[PDB]
């Protein structure tokens, strides 16, 4: 898969695999396996996890 787009300025824009919508500054969380980034509501995250806790997205969590 590939969830990073580039705009005409060369900047990288991450797309959330849960909703196929871009990062819009609202809180996201990064998967410590595949490194895709998700919107918190899209993965049921309601507040920042403990700093020490790794987080894995639904796809990887079943792997």
């Amino acid at each position: 898969s590939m969830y990073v787009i580039r705009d005409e300025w060369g900047n990288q824009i991450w797309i959330c695999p849960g909703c196929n919508k871009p990062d819009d500054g609202s809180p996201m969380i990064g998967c410590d396996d595949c490194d895709d980034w998700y919107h918190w509501p899209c993965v049921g995250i309601m507040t920042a996890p403990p700093e020490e806790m790794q987080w894995f997205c639904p796809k990887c969590a079943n792997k």
Partner: peptide, 7 residues
């Protein structure tokens, strides 16, 4: 975990 919020 790794989190961000930009706006």
């Amino acid at each position: 975990a790794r989190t961000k919020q930009t706006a």
